[PDB]
Symmetry: C2
Subunit: 129 residues, 2 copies
Amino acid sequence: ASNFTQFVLVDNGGTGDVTVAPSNFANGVAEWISSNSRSQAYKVTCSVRQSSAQNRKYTIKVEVPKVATQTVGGVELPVAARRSYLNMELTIPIFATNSDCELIVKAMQGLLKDGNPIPSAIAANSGIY
Amino acid sequence: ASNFTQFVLVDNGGTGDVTVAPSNFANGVAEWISSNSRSQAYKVTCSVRQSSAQNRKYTIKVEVPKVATQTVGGVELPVAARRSYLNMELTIPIFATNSDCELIVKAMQGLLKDGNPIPSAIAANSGIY
């Protein structure tokens, strides 16, 4: 059904996983955070709303601290790291059945699978062709 | 590095998988499609661009035919099915290393894992709390 529970954002196959935990519920916006903000702070946001209602719209934001910042040269004290961020927007029909819904998480999980084009492009910081 | 190759959008554990194939390359926009448009048409779009260049911005669109439309009552001949769509936008720093990049696909793959909150909410067509 839903959650507002702790999850593993980054599985690194062993205790060393990144986990985010419910931090806030500011106005329809549910927020998760990690051992937050010192060369850290993984942040996840999720809201839901009826857009031109025929549809529902899930707005998910992800902020990655990037294993980037401070982990290189000079600049002792980071800040604003020069993280990455994901802004995902999913529109689904209001009465989409759970099979409709299930199908969607699978196309999603699929778009993003390890040796696949999109994620292969992203990881090398490249283009598609 | 990248692809413009055929992939499995929906893995249903056996031949019955949904696969999208390179269909077009209309202007920086790479497009994938499936056995397209008759209670069908899974469509994937991916473009990349230098946004306020300090950053690169990957814009991914997914259209799910929804196992929805025609698979219920009346309305013989569908059209516009009343599909779902995902509009994802990823901003990454221009010179993010591949470890920075790798980290990002993992937070992503993580946000979306099977028993996790977000995907659990989406699949039931619910809220987070």
